Design a protein around this ligand. Structure first.
Ligand SMILES: CC(=O)N[C@H]1[C@H](O[C@@H]2[C@@H](O)[C@H](O)O[C@H](CO)[C@@H]2O)O[C@H](CO)[C@@H](O[C@@H]2O[C@H](CO)[C@H](O)[C@H](O[C@]3(C(=O)O)C[C@H](O)[C@@H](NC(C)=O)[C@H]([C@H](O)[C@H](O)CO)O3)[C@H]2O)[C@@H]1O
Ligand SMILES: CC(=O)N[C@H]1[C@H](O[C@@H]2[C@@H](O)[C@H](O)O[C@H](CO)[C@@H]2O)O[C@H](CO)[C@@H](O[C@@H]2O[C@H](CO)[C@H](O)[C@H](O[C@]3(C(=O)O)C[C@H](O)[C@@H](NC(C)=O)[C@H]([C@H](O)[C@H](O)CO)O3)[C@H]2O)[C@@H]1O
Ligand SMILES: CC(=O)N[C@H]1[C@H](O[C@@H]2[C@@H](O)[C@H](O)O[C@H](CO)[C@@H]2O)O[C@H](CO)[C@@H](O[C@@H]2O[C@H](CO)[C@H](O)[C@H](O[C@]3(C(=O)O)C[C@H](O)[C@@H](NC(C)=O)[C@H]([C@H](O)[C@H](O)CO)O3)[C@H]2O)[C@@H]1O
Ligand SMILES: *[C@@H]1O[C@H](CO)[C@@H](O[C@@H]2O[C@H](CO)[C@@H](O[C@@H]3O[C@H](CO)[C@@H](O)[C@H](O)[C@@H]3O)[C@H](O)[C@H]2NC(C)=O)[C@H](O)[C@H]1NC(C)=O
Ligand SMILES: *[C@@H]1O[C@H](CO)[C@@H](O[C@@H]2O[C@H](CO)[C@@H](O[C@@H]3O[C@H](CO)[C@@H](O)[C@H](O)[C@@H]3O)[C@H](O)[C@H]2NC(C)=O)[C@H](O)[C@H]1NC(C)=O
Ligand SMILES: *[C@@H]1O[C@H](CO)[C@@H](O[C@@H]2O[C@H](CO)[C@@H](O[C@@H]3O[C@H](CO)[C@@H](O)[C@H](O)[C@@H]3O)[C@H](O)[C@H]2NC(C)=O)[C@H](O)[C@H]1NC(C)=O
Ligand SMILES: *[C@@H]1O[C@H](CO)[C@@H](O)[C@H](O)[C@H]1NC(C)=O
Ligand SMILES: *[C@@H]1O[C@H](CO)[C@@H](O)[C@H](O)[C@H]1NC(C)=O
Ligand SMILES: *[C@@H]1O[C@H](CO)[C@@H](O)[C@H](O)[C@H]1NC(C)=O
Ligand SMILES: *[C@@H]1O[C@H](CO)[C@@H](O)[C@H](O)[C@H]1NC(C)=O
Ligand SMILES: *[C@@H]1O[C@H](CO)[C@@H](O)[C@H](O)[C@H]1NC(C)=O
Ligand SMILES: *[C@@H]1O[C@H](CO)[C@@H](O)[C@H](O)[C@H]1NC(C)=O
Lengths: 171, 325, 325, 171, 325, 171
């Protein structure tokens, strides 16, 4: 992937995270658990749902072939009709097959980027207070209970609240 | 204590292709193409199609004596013609502008048969002896088209000038037919229509037609070396038709009030069964029941169908790359 | 002390759509589609169009006595035909290859009318009594086409064999017309052209034509049960035309030197006003003044127009997502 | 956005920066002010102007429908002509509408990336000498006058010149 | 001690265009369009084309006495017709359904010439005096088409009713020709076919034809004011043809067993040399030897060719932006 | 470039690296040298080769124009045939020219992203132990012989093995 996250520095997915596309695994004194980031998941669902519907909506016309016949002395127009019908059949097949390959490539990049941005979002909050292991995991230099975990996930993490405790353990 | 960022994985084995990569397994995807059909004909807009069975379009609309099952009024959502139908033009000859006639009929929805010229129209001629073993019914060896009448001169007299007129005072256009007989020799000619130069002339406000018999022996077809040139036209609402002949006329007898479909109109050449079912999309090779955008079943259809395409699959990724561990 | 990185925001409320997102407000964008037109006809290449007014193409080019305003030479950038024009074919009958004739005329740019066969060409016949109340002018109840002459036999004699020849020694192809009269009965025939089998024969180096009158009563149109089969052809530069008839000939009299347009050529069926203005792009529904790439006004145009498309808007983002605070 | 800058970690735009698409807001003893980065702005204007003109140039052909008529006995060719004209009208409408949706999505990503790269460009120069607030803003650990500001903007910032002063204030 | 990350640069000066940027030098790229051709005609599927040389299609297939080099059996991968070929229809007149005939011939692959009606078929008429200086061979000033025979009445008798029959018992359709002579005056008519109303009638199981001479003086072409209406048809396997005339018949003599190509079939109008070479792709303007996907040489071709496109170059980047230092 | 690496923070390419698209230049006591990263190069070759072949495969139909003639009285169908042929010629030219411009832009971005991700991959391993010069180059705070170099290149670099030595020289 061009953003380097999915099947990249985060090597695999989580079968244990069943309620969304992107999310977190946390681990503290109260234990372990998965949780989807609903906001980035929902936003992605909305974008991709929009892409699918937009494609369907643009492919919502049909070229119509006919059962019309042609005599032995209408070989020219008979073949004109045939080449025309085969003509449009070829452009629409091209349009559909090419669009799908192009869109699939960009859809997968989108997810890759979203996972990447979620990781950055967390790194930016922790800064000093946690150690980045290079695999999407952050080890805290302090105690992070359930509310501390939840603060990281809703983007309200309190860096200065934990920096003294972190700095002590870090150094 | 720690928190990790990550992504969904699942049990999916479904794959998509991309420009950079083939056979990529993804967590969620959606197929846009339908490749499945019900191999049968159904109703469209709860309206049944017209099965020709063992009659061709020509045999049905001319009134071939073996197409009596179809004879009369018909309504249809589309027409199914059978590939090896035998009952078409029984007395050898060409139906003029045949392909244009089929396209016209295909654009229709309902025909009402009616007597346009009663045989009483034609004065001083015989209207009861116009049969042939080229056109048998299921009960007699010698009959003729139900919508045409083969006129022969009487007892021993001459074939006089006969005339006919119909004024379309209705709201519907009228599809009608007529012919000109071409005997194999000058004796048959004389024996049927008498001596003299014969003609068939017809005219409306927008159409006029004139033909004379062309006497020659053609190869035998259905026992006949003679021919008939069949013709057809459409008498518009408000138009009147004048007929004038002194021999060799196969006269219009019954005709059709024609209701043109606002929609598309289809003529399917198929041996597929017509069953008791409803459909929204009917292709020539079967019914489609889908909410899908594409289909690779057929370019020929009636109703609201998905776009025809040659692809085997158009699978769009929605979820992400599936990497379970 | 500090420095921040950031991006432009503005007062824009203009939105675009993307594959992932509808109604996204952007700082700058550009509309590629024109939906606006001037509801009128203008000049193209400073050349005025030809308004037929109350004449149809057939009435104009045949010389219908009520199309005298148009009679003679015409130049045009395109042709405007009015929907309910009344002056076309006054004496009932079919103009042969009508659709091909219109396409031909549409490919033109200028016609020069000229006398092709003076009435003196036709020896031993009457050229002064060929009128009808089917074709009135604005001054007499009985006239005829300005470009044709209805030939009738003289006083009491027979209709002899008349002949005519024109050698196109010019550089331009010549568009000309002729007809064959079809009387309702054999008395009218005899009264006009005399007894005998009549014919109209015509030939050039590449064309030959032969027809004989087809006598029958058709329904009455404009007081006439008789008909005329009108015909047209193009005499190429260097070709000569030979005419030979012994009756039933509606003769070519005046014809047209025809200048073919190198360009496209259009025939607009519209009731839109022709005004005193210039244009580069003229559609059938009005003028476009744009530098835009697309338009949803009409697929029918003359001049240099933008690509026709069904869309209501093709707005391309140029600036970024507008997020003011 | 897939690069996470626009309406991302930089939450909004600046109505106060009127002379370009991307740029800076600085703040020191001589005061505050906006300034566009002309180089990245111009480069983006050039790219996007090229994209618009390339699209216009490819859409510079026209399919031409005709006023040709057909008789009652030319129903087949009349309908062939109609289906052909409607045929091309449908592919061109598709081409135009689909291109616009695709291009708009990629145009917005381009800007997002450009803002992102400009931020990285500044972060890479400062390193130690400034504190990243996680919103596109850098607080200097030293005094940055107008020429120091301008050096950051033209990519000639002198890290070792300010590191002693910065390190003192930082620690 | 240090490690750096970086990318390839090279000596490439090859450039591509992108949506955002023109003339970008890249390390590696691939051209998809072929603009090169060998200006000549070659063999396709190791099968040579048929060069008409100084004969047109009509002159070849009618048997114009100056097309004797071509006379007989021919096989071809395609047909090369030369632009200023002189030997076509020598005796003035129209070949009916000419364009349809060319399309038919183009769909073919091989013709076998054979005698369909020996002159002995026509009893009580002269088959030895049907020549004209309109159709010279290279050895006599007065000859005629090798595949047709101009029938004239004998010594002083009348032109009786002549008849002919051919039953296609073979597996191949038969392409054949015939004509009707149209004399300039009634004396020439009488001098050649005698007095009376003459006709030419023909019929098969699916075709019937009837025509009568149309006597008039047309402008002179190749010394002739008379005309011939040439005709052609295809006698299907199992069909039989009946001929019946009493004058004015240009009779079918030799005809062609016709093998239809399963493939495409082409008729190239070109003055390009046919050389001794093989090809897989032959356009009208020359041979393409490529593995490329596109070509801007010609839309007209035979064989397996790349897609025709108007572009000058379709260069796809594969490597990265080239930035050497 | 939207990823900011190629002709960005890594200003130029290397004529000296001839065996691949992306790679390394190292420098230690045993000397200097270039080496391609075969894995990311090969992956890119495979992707791009796939893109080229997919395009070729979709463009593998031909619309076929004919040599059919039309008489003076078949002007309408003659012109219908002409407009049809010119019709398809115009859509296919459009399809080809537009695809190439679009694909070239995305191909160059792919490379840019790949170089970018390779740089991140190395930065993530070194962390403390090396100094990032902001131009794709890392100066080690310790001695990195040939096997240490090779470990960085195959992603098995041993951070804790060198951190004491690095920390001493760094501070
Ligand atoms: C063997 C053969 O072909 N015989 C046909 C015969 O030709 C003669 C040759 O046999 C002989 O060698 O040489 C002769 C000259 O020297 C002749 O060429 O020609 C007669 C007619 O002249 C043919 O009779 C027709 O045979 C048909 C066989 O299917 C059929 O029986 C015809 O009868 C009907 C019919 O059913 O159509 C009888 C109908 O009542 C009558 N209907 C009406 C309304 O007229 C028609 C009608 O008279 C004809 O269809 C008009 O063409 O005929 C019978 O006429 C003989 O087959
Ligand atoms: C009521 C009706 O239709 N009457 C027409 C008449 O038919 C007869 C019936 O009335 C009667 O019940 O039964 C009869 C047999 O038993 C008849 O069927 O037929 C005559 C002609 O034979 C019709 O006369 C025509 O009437 C027209 C009315 O619009 C018109 O007045 C015709 O006169 C002109 C004309 O203006 O076109 C007079 C022109 O001078 C003359 N021009 C030339 C160059 O010849 C022409 C020309 O003679 C004809 O157009 C050729 O067809 O006629 C008048 O002939 C009557 O309407
Ligand atoms: C100068 C001119 O056009 N003369 C032609 C002549 O018209 C007469 C005028 O000269 C005179 O001023 O006025 C007269 C009435 O008052 C005439 O209009 O008409 C004759 C025929 O009637 C023309 O003779 C034809 O001339 C041709 C010149 O190329 C040619 O020599 C014709 O001879 C052939 C031929 O080669 O085709 C001789 C063939 O043996 C014969 N073949 C057969 C199988 O019949 C044919 C055939 O008879 C005709 O082609 C049938 O139309 O004719 C010669 O007939 C004279 O040119
Ligand atoms: C994001 O997550 C944080 C951390 O869980 C959420 O903040 C927490 O919100 C709850 C209720 O709003 C607070 O519970 C309360 O605690 C106080 C004592 O501190 C007690 O007096 C109340 O009765 C109640 O139990 C919790 O303290 C608070 N944590 C903080 C702010 O330190 C926050 O709601 C989430 N933010 C978003 C964006 O929704
Ligand atoms: C990027 O911005 C920097 C900082 O503003 C620019 O460097 C500055 O350029 C001006 C003139 O080139 C220098 O002004 C001069 O200062 C010296 C004393 O230091 C004085 O003797 C001269 O009379 C003049 O006033 C200024 O010092 C210099 N700052 C530096 C280099 O420390 C630079 O021009 C810009 N670079 C680019 C890429 O254009
Ligand atoms: C990535 O590169 C590293 C560093 O070059 C590779 O590790 C090295 O692999 C070789 C053979 O596997 C080792 O050589 C051996 O050294 C030991 C003494 O340490 C000696 O007893 C053996 O006879 C042999 O000479 C080398 O030590 C080892 N370096 C390590 C692991 O510290 C590694 O193979 C590469 N990894 C991949 C992904 O292929
Ligand atoms: C790859 O693709 C084809 C269908 O296109 C499939 O038949 C084949 O089994 C796939 N290979 C894999 C990865 O299973
Ligand atoms: C019958 O047709 C004639 C045309 O010949 C027309 O004038 C008349 O109106 C029609 N009948 C009625 C009742 O209108
Ligand atoms: C969304 O789009 C439609 C036009 O496509 C517009 O009429 C509607 O008002 C828009 N909604 C918003 C966000 O204002
Ligand atoms: C007149 O036409 C004849 C053809 O019949 C031609 O030979 C002649 O050249 C033409 N007139 C002139 C002056 O050329
Ligand atoms: C830019 O492109 C054209 C071909 O499209 C070429 O002729 C011209 O020399 C190029 N300019 C440069 C950068 O050399
Ligand atoms: C000859 O043609 C006739 C049709 O008139 C056909 O019946 C016959 O079978 C053919 N000859 C042979 C040997 O079959």
């Amino acid at each position: 992937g061009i953003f380097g996250a999915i099947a990249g520095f985060i090597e695999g997915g989580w079968t244990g995270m069943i309620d969304g596309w992107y999310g977190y695994h946390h681990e503290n004194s109260q234990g372990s658990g998965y949780a989807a980031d609903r906001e980035s998941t929902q936003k992605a669902i909305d974008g991709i749902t929009n892409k699918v519907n937009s494609i369907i909506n643009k492919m919502n016309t049909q070229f119509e072939a006919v059962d019309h016949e042609f005599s032995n002395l209408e070989r020219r127009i008979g073949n004109l009709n045939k080449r025309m019908e085969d003509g449009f059949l070829d452009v629409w097949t091209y349009n559909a097959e090419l669009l799908v390959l192009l869109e699939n490539e960009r859809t997968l990049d989108l997810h890759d980027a979203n996972v990447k941005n979620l990781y950055e979002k967390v790194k930016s909050q922790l800064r000093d207070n946690a150690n980045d292991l290079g695999n999407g995991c952050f080890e805290f230099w302090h105690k992070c209970d359930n509310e501390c975990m939840e603060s990281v996930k809703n983007g309200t993490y309190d860096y200065p609240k934990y920096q003294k405790e972190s700095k002590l353990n870090r150094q | 204590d720690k928190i990790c960022i990550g992504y969904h994985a699942n049990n999916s084995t479904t794959q998509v292709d991309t420009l950079l990569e083939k056979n990529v397994t993804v967590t969620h995807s959606v197929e846009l193409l339908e490749n499945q059909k019900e191999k049968r004909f159904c109703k469209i807009m709860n309206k049944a199609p017209l099965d020709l069975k063992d009659c061709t379009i020509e045999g049905w609309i001319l009134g071939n004596p073996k197409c009596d099952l179809l004879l009369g009024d018909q309504s249809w959502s589309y027409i199914v013609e059978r590939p090896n139908a035998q009952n078409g033009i029984c007395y050898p000859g060409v139906l003029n502008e045949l392909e244009e006639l089929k396209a016209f009929i295909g654009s229709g929805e309902r025909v009402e048969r009616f007597e346009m010229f009663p045989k009483s129209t034609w004065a001083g001629v015989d209207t009861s002896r116009g049969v042939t073993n080229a056109c048998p019914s299921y009960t007699l060896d010698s009959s003729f088209y139900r919508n045409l009448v083969w006129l022969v001169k009487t007892d021993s007299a001459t074939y006089p000038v006969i005339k006919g007129t119909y004024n379309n005072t209705g709201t519907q256009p009228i599809l009608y037919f007529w012919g000109v007989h071409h005997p194999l020799d000058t004796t048959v000619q004389d024996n049927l229509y008498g001596s003299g130069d014969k003609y068939v002339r017809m005219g409306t406000e927008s159409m006029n037609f004139a033909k004379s018999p062309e006497i020659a022996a053609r190869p035998a077809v259905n026992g006949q070396r003679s021919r008939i040139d069949y013709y057809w036209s459409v008498l518009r609402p408000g138009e009147t038709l004048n007929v004038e002949s002194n021999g060799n006329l196969i006269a219009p007898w019954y005709a059709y009030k024609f209701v043109s479909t606002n929609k598309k109109g289809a003529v399917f050449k198929s041996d597929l069964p017509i069953e008791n079912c409803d459909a929204t999309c009917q292709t020539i090779t079967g019914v489609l029941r889908t909410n899908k955008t594409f289909q690779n079943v057929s370019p020929l259809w009636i109703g609201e169908c998905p776009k025809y395409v040659k692809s085997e699959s158009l699978r769009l990724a929605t979820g992400l790359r599936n990497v379970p561990q």
